[PDB]
Design an enzyme around this catalytic site. Structure first.
Site, mmCIF file in Angstrom:
data_model
loop_
_atom_site.group_PDB
_atom_site.id
_atom_site.type_symbol
_atom_site.label_atom_id
_atom_site.label_comp_id
_atom_site.label_asym_id
_atom_site.label_seq_id
_atom_site.Cartn_x
_atom_site.Cartn_y
_atom_site.Cartn_z
ATOM 1 N N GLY A 134 45.200 10.276 27.215
ATOM 2 C CA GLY A 134 44.307 9.138 27.337
ATOM 3 C C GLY A 134 44.694 8.198 26.201
ATOM 4 N N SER A 135 44.207 6.965 26.219
ATOM 5 C CA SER A 135 44.562 6.025 25.169
ATOM 6 C C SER A 135 44.148 6.491 23.772
ATOM 7 C CB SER A 135 43.966 4.644 25.456
ATOM 8 O OG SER A 135 42.559 4.647 25.358
ATOM 9 N N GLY A 195 32.034 34.296 34.275
ATOM 10 C CA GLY A 195 31.796 34.218 35.703
ATOM 11 C C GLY A 195 32.049 32.823 36.239
ATOM 12 N N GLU A 225 44.266 9.221 22.539
ATOM 13 C CA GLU A 225 45.150 10.259 22.028
ATOM 14 C C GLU A 225 46.598 9.808 21.803
ATOM 15 O OE1 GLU A 225 43.189 10.788 25.016
ATOM 16 O OE2 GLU A 225 41.662 11.082 23.480
ATOM 17 N N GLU A 260 41.255 18.337 33.179
ATOM 18 C CA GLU A 260 40.840 19.079 31.991
ATOM 19 C C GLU A 260 40.419 20.537 32.175
ATOM 20 O OE1 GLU A 260 39.886 16.034 32.814
ATOM 21 O OE2 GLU A 260 41.196 14.944 31.426
ATOM 22 N N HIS A 297 40.857 13.938 26.398
ATOM 23 C CA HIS A 297 40.512 12.533 26.262
ATOM 24 C C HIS A 297 39.027 12.239 26.186
ATOM 25 C CE1 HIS A 297 40.768 8.230 26.539
ATOM 26 N NE2 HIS A 297 40.079 8.222 27.666
ATOM 27 N N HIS A 334 24.782 42.148 35.090
ATOM 28 C CA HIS A 334 24.927 41.049 36.032
ATOM 29 C C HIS A 334 23.728 41.078 36.968
ATOM 30 C CE1 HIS A 334 26.303 38.213 38.858
ATOM 31 N NE2 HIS A 334 27.594 38.495 38.873
HETATM 32 C C1 LIG Z 1 32.046 27.043 38.683
HETATM 33 C C2 LIG Z 1 31.263 27.988 39.524
HETATM 34 N N1 LIG Z 1 30.556 27.538 40.627
HETATM 35 C C3 LIG Z 1 29.847 28.447 41.375
HETATM 36 C C4 LIG Z 1 29.790 29.778 41.101
HETATM 37 C C5 LIG Z 1 28.981 30.740 41.969
HETATM 38 N N2 LIG Z 1 29.838 31.676 42.841
HETATM 39 C C6 LIG Z 1 30.012 32.915 42.436
HETATM 40 S S1 LIG Z 1 30.943 33.896 43.406
HETATM 41 C C7 LIG Z 1 31.172 32.580 44.505
HETATM 42 C C8 LIG Z 1 32.004 32.796 45.733
HETATM 43 C C9 LIG Z 1 33.487 32.492 45.636
HETATM 44 O O1 LIG Z 1 34.201 33.255 46.580
HETATM 45 P P1 LIG Z 1 35.724 33.412 46.976
HETATM 46 O O2 LIG Z 1 36.477 33.404 45.688
HETATM 47 O O3 LIG Z 1 36.125 32.504 48.020
HETATM 48 O O4 LIG Z 1 35.764 34.882 47.533
HETATM 49 P P2 LIG Z 1 34.747 36.117 47.785
HETATM 50 O O5 LIG Z 1 33.399 35.645 47.306
HETATM 51 O O6 LIG Z 1 34.632 36.200 49.293
HETATM 52 O O7 LIG Z 1 35.260 37.191 46.983
HETATM 53 C C10 LIG Z 1 30.499 31.437 44.046
HETATM 54 C C11 LIG Z 1 30.484 30.127 44.750
HETATM 55 C C12 LIG Z 1 30.540 30.202 39.942
HETATM 56 N N3 LIG Z 1 30.593 31.457 39.527
HETATM 57 N N4 LIG Z 1 31.263 29.273 39.179
HETATM 58 O O1 LIG Z 2 42.936 5.906 28.602
HETATM 59 C C1 LIG Z 2 42.157 4.975 28.577
HETATM 60 O O2 LIG Z 2 42.301 3.964 27.935
HETATM 61 C C2 LIG Z 2 40.860 5.026 29.386
HETATM 62 O O3 LIG Z 2 40.535 6.417 29.711
HETATM 63 C C3 LIG Z 2 40.886 4.134 30.681
HETATM 64 C C4 LIG Z 2 41.899 3.137 30.883
HETATM 65 C C5 LIG Z 2 41.911 2.341 32.047
HETATM 66 C C6 LIG Z 2 40.905 2.535 33.024
HETATM 67 C C7 LIG Z 2 39.903 3.509 32.843
HETATM 68 C C8 LIG Z 2 39.893 4.304 31.683
#
Ligand SMILES: Cc1ncc(C[n+]2csc(CCOP(=O)(O)OP(=O)(O)O)c2C)c(N)n1
Ligand SMILES: O=C(O)[C@H](O)c1ccccc1
Ligand SMILES: Cc1ncc(C[n+]2csc(CCOP(=O)(O)OP(=O)(O)O)c2C)c(N)n1
Ligand SMILES: Cc1ncc(C[n+]2csc(CCOP(=O)(O)OP(=O)(O)O)c2C)c(N)n1
Ligand SMILES: O=C(O)[C@H](O)c1ccccc1
Ligand SMILES: O=C(O)[C@H](O)c1ccccc1
Ligand SMILES: [Mg+2]
Ligand SMILES: [Mg+2]
Ligand SMILES: [Mg+2]
Ligand SMILES: [Mg+2]
Ligand SMILES: [Mg+2]
Lengths: 524, 524, 524
Positions: free
Chosen positions: C24-25, C400, C27, C46, C69, C280
């Site tokens: 980003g700028s 998780g 940085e 990110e 950024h 869990h």
């Molecule tokens: C960032 C995020 N969003 C949502 C969840 C909730 N979550 C836990 S398990 C799961 C299912 C994902 O399943 P997949 O990897 O497709 O396979 P399977 O469940 O059938 O093993 C979700 C949505 C999480 N843990 N993290």
């Molecule tokens: O890197 C930057 O300067 C900044 O994230 C940015 C620049 C141009 C448009 C949107 C955002």
């Protein structure tokens, strides 16, 4: 120009001319060459510094400037800030930081993670990223504290910033005028007015912000037009209505059930400048009895959001009060009958009953006297026995934080030199910010301190009963000589063990040219 | 059982039997039915409450339990917590919250965003999500405060939780024993020992954590084996070495340049239980002169991280001190020669010079006396004129926050009933936590308070002179009668306007059975 | 030298040579003139940047440097940081701030109240008060992340700081060596060893920190000496023991009751490098059955404090594991019998059963392969069917948080070029950080991605079944072509609709010279 010079110019240009504080090395670069158009008010402890400034700000209805010493100084004032937050007090709290060159190693006096220290008790907390930014940061502090809803702000400044050059473009900060004097739009305002005009049995509840906006008069008018009874919202930090006006119905008890009971029968309840509602004791029940509809006009979004019932309008209390007072029709209903004078309690020739003290104060104090209350177990009788006709006549720790009244009474008296300030403080409460007395003596601020001495934390003994609690330690505070304490800080002291002595003491205090403390022997 | 019962059981099972606090309604449900095996110590203001508990914890070398009232109470103790944080004081700060049923509307006394209030001055801040969780939360508080690096913790509890049923599985908390008594692994420890054995001209710098771990003896040994000079790290909150031992070289000035100068010529500098380094004044220069290598043994990761130079080992100071003391070889070098006694300053029959006071104290005070220092402009002379042979003999506000010494001296005296505590406090500093005196009187804690009265913020006037800063307001504090203040809180008071009076006063105070305050007239 | 030059010198001197980030700028001033001895790894988002760095850090067992950024960039990585916090991943997260001259007006890209943004997911978060402080701040970041317990740290730097002059004294930062390789003191260690030697039926539970400290071998020894069964703490983020060693008893189910049941009969349970316990599902019961005593060795004070039972020792897992392994006596008891091989599930010629996939992977993958798991509903079968003999062979999102495995697998593969990395990811999980694939393609990092495609959030459907929760929306994720997605980012893709195709695909992927994604049709 230096950051130092530019900042003081900004301050004066923004109407500030008084600095409340307790010095430290980190603040010397800021305090040196103190402008002759400014005055410094010293307090022996930060809780007292902020307490005094708070009273000054609330009474003067303008922001108050504070200067504390790094973390420790800011820390000692945290309790005071909790009150300031609840009363929407416009306080500009600045604290000296270590020189930028030594913040890294965390040298003694480095305010670590500074901005987070006063949180969550401030509207805005900040530390500039460079010396040239200080004037701008100060500008933000000033306005953040002044805009509705007013409140305390915190600005931390490394001491080596003051001597640095200020950005020339900073002059654009000097005369900035920011306004929040706003009110509901026309269309919606009429809808509200019509609702009030249609109310068959309206009721009005007023909060501290009414007195802060000096909207008292307009509220009196509004109440007379609607021919409605007026109550003061619970845990009242200020008095927003003349306590002897025919409409006045007193201070609402801080209970959910108690209040819904009081409002029962009223179709429309208009609340102005108060939280809905600052309850205290646990008194479970209905927020509102069926048939009662509530409308709240608040200056604080946070208040409007947490109200568990009714509609709300977030706007300036002064603007709204005025607008409403001039738009509602004159109801043909009979104006409420004034509440009868409270009964005179039996009083022998011994220790005094709180009632007696208030009755006496009411008889002897000037009509434009200003009271402060920190006699925690006598608030109800006080609100009933003191005829407060004018605005800014009552102050009570908005957050229930003891240690406010004593120093605040000095601030109020400093702000209102023509009005006799009388602070009624319990023997227990008097200790929290006892050192504040010194400031009154030093600057000869004629505040009168009435210490209600019953040798115990009365209010707590009360809650103990309702909470049905036994074997509770630390409820008694025997062995305190307040006249000796007053002498310790150079304040004239008097003793009153009975009614005749009380009268004599009051008369002497009233006519005294300096501060006076009266130790009153009250019944447990 | 109830959350109430289970918590007190956990507390006693964890060795806690004393509660330091200032009551409020939110805490009544917790304080009611106060166990007979516990004692409550009341202080008139939160800064005093925590100050006393702090001293008690530091001297007893065990955590201290505190109970404050919601936000306002916690707020009033923020300044005290800033010191506790710097001294690694194991303080368990608990504050009463509003009943869960009224937290939503933010009823008076609701501690809003509670956990964030004491931040960043606590190791851990928390509020349980349910009543049954309280005992567990309490357990976490106890251990978080006790584990290295020790420090203050905060726990907020809604008052309606105490009466609720506790989880039966909570008994598993009662006897948990958590240890952090660790030291560097064998291989690496030998490498360190060899480096020390190889040092041609080693130097040792000791910090407050040495005294906290009672590693003083071991450090004396270590110093004698290595035949090395010993200095106390700057801004010393405690004394970690006998000040008259032949190796002792005194308190290091809190300056970067000053210290690198002092250490010049020493190939290896071993720092134990201290931050590297708690500088104060801005004294720019080299962190270390070429030829000097530094090794730091600290109990705090935060200390090791911010050290601008040298290597570091994060471990228990007690364990490391002991290990090192028993592994290093006995150097054949000559043991350092003891520093000469300080010169006797001229003293007429008038106001006293600080030097005179300390010389007198040194002559009259018992050899196992415990001193506390809050006479900000006389610290250097004090460290030179007091022969402190034993551990836990010196305490100074670790964060520079005034208002510590007075209440802390009461705590220390309560923890060490067999050792005479003598707090030397400046006339300005004495005001911050003046109400603490009451506690000493009430519980008849024989602390001796020596007020150095020169009517001014001496340390500040000094600095003013360096800054050649002129026109600095609020530097003088005239008009304070400390004997009157002492009387106000029931403490015997004495006056000393000259040396003969000083001697007489001290002699009387020493033999007095209760607390005594001596107002000493010192030179400006 | 410039802050820029000095910082890169500090970095290389501290062993850092790789920068993971998304530019980003703010940085650019930091990234310009990128040293030739450093390499930059770009990720398209990110969450992927931090995910990759995380895997790299965990496998390399050294801190990983990240550059994001401002707020938005830091923000996108918050989810990743939640996992890093739970796995004690030493991540140095740096984010570019606006130029100090424009932070006041809050120009676009100003990271407001920066340090608070990543909280509470970092051990330390900070923004320097001046450019010259940057190198020192960076030093703090490096060490705060590396000291036990390791974890992510955050440093925000205004972009105009880099070109400014660095403090000459900064060179003292270059070679600072901070150690936390500590272990329980001798006296107390023997007491522990004797307790283990006396245990009639001991049990050992190992956590992620064991694998992080590479204390696996020592734990194997310790287990064989005590002739005790070994379990992996619940919600295992890593594998700390060879899964086919005679003592191994598998992954403990994340339930309170389930675990106390498992441990019943064992008089002494020794837990090393794991929280007690990362439960869990809600499986209420006893923390421990009567007769079972628990002892925990953790590197995290926060872990020791919240353990609801047993004693704890806070020290370095490597040091402790080694010490214990070499001190305990060889028990005369019979070494536990290895658990039997899991049953072979029925598999027709259609969609594959997870079991089949794992069995096949086990047969075809090299013995030193490294697995990553983000196939949420198949974790149990996976832990049973994969023979992982060596350390650093398993990784699962520690908090998780899905979106870890895919990018992390690339980081691990980058850290272990000689070990085949195979990430088994569910079709739903694969989407969170899908763009990470690009990095694998660009830097030709031969990671193998096995997508388990059953078109649904399987794990959530399971739980739905327990809750008997019905009419839950958003549980299905049909319509995703992973081969197309792989193609989108330049990664070779394969499809496996049955066992024969699986075998063929794996064989091809294994021998492929670049990254390969295999979409496997699994049963719902
Ligand atoms: C960032 C995020 N969003 C949502 C969840 C909730 N979550 C836990 S398990 C799961 C299912 C994902 O399943 P997949 O990897 O497709 O396979 P399977 O469940 O059938 O093993 C979700 C949505 C999480 N843990 N993290
Ligand atoms: O890197 C930057 O300067 C900044 O994230 C940015 C620049 C141009 C448009 C949107 C955002
Ligand atoms: C700073 C602070 N500490 C503690 C409390 C709790 N508290 C509330 S009322 C009270 C009693 C004070 O009583 P006093 O003013 O002596 O008179 P009375 O109660 O008899 O009216 C106390 C200790 C508080 N509100 N603020
Ligand atoms: C709570 C707090 N407020 C302010 C300061 C700043 N300060 C430091 S030293 C000092 C002077 C106090 O002097 P006194 O104890 O009377 O004696 P001295 O040794 O200075 O003459 C002050 C006000 C501080 N350290 N802590
Ligand atoms: O003002 C200061 O420099 C600082 O608060 C200080 C100075 C001297 C002793 C203690 C604390
Ligand atoms: O203890 C309490 O209930 C609370 O602090 C309180 C009670 C009465 C007046 C003010 C404040
Ligand atoms: Mg805070
Ligand atoms: Mg009272
Ligand atoms: Mg003085
Ligand atoms: Mg955040
Ligand atoms: Mg799936």
């Amino acid at each position: 120009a230096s950051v130092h010079g530019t900042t003081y110019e900004l301050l004066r240009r923004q109407g500030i001319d008084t600095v409340f504080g307790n010095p430290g090395s980190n603040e010397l670069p800021f305090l040196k060459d103190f402008p002759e158009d400014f005055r410094y008010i010293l307090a022996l402890q930060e809780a007292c510094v902020v307490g005094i400034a708070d009273g000054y700000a609330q009474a003067s209805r303008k922001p108050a400037f504070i200067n504390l010493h790094s973390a420790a100084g800011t820390g000692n004032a945290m309790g005071a800030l909790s009150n300031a937050w609840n009363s929407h007090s416009p306080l500009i709290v600045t604290a000296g930081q270590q020189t930028r060159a030594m913040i890294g190693v965390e040298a003694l006096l480095t305010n670590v993670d500074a901005a987070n220290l006063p949180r969550p008790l401030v509207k805005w907390s900040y530390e500039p990223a460079s010396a040239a930014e200080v004037p701008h940061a100060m500008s933000r502090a000033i306005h953040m504290a002044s805009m509705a809803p007013q409140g305390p702000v915190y600005l931390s400044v490394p001491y080596d910033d003051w001597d640095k050059d200020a950005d020339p473009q900073s002059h654009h900060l000097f005369d900035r005028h920011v306004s929040s004097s706003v009110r509901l739009n026309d269309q919606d305002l009429d809808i509200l007015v019509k609702a009030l005009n249609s109310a068959s049995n309206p009721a009005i509840v007023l909060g501290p912000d009414v007195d802060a906006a000096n909207a008292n008069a307009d509220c009196v008018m509004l109440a007379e037009r609607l021919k409605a009874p007026v109550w003061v919202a619970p845990s009242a930090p200020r008095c927003p209505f003349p306590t002897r006006h025919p409409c006045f119905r007193g201070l609402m008890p801080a209970g959910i059930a108690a209040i819904s009971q009081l409002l029962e029968g009223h179709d429309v309840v208009l609340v102005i400048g108060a939280p809905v509602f600052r309850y205290h004791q646990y008194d479970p029940g209905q927020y509102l009895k069926p048939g009662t509809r509530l409308i709240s006009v608040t200056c604080d979004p946070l208040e409007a959001a947490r109200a568990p019932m009714g509609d709300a309008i977030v706007a300036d209390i002064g603007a709204m009060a005025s607008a409403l007072a001039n738009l509602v029709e004159e109801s043909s209903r009979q104006l409420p009958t004034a509440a009868p004078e409270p009964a005179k309690v039996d009083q022998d020739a011994g220790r005094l009953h709180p009632e007696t003290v208030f009755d006496t104060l009411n008889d002897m104090a000037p009509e434009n006297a200003i009271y402060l209350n920190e006699s925690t177990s006598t608030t109800a009788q006080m609100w009933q026995r003191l005829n407060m006709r004018n605005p800014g006549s009552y102050y009570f720790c908005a957050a229930g934080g003891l240690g406010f009244a004593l120093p605040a009474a000095i601030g109020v008296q400093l702000a209102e030199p023509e009005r006799q300030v009388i602070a009624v403080i319990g023997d227990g409460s008097a200790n929290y910010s006892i050192s504040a007395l010194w400031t009154a003596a030093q600057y000869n601020i004629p505040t009168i301190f009435v210490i209600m001495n019953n040798g115990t934390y009365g209010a707590l003994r009360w809650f103990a009963g309702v909470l049905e609690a036994e074997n509770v330690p630390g409820l008694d505070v025997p062995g305190i000589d307040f006249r000796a304490l007053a002498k310790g800080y150079g304040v004239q002291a008097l003793k009153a063990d009975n009614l005749e002595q009380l009268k004599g003491s009051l008369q002497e205090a009233l006519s005294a040219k300096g501060p006076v403390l009266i130790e009153v022997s009250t019944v447990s």
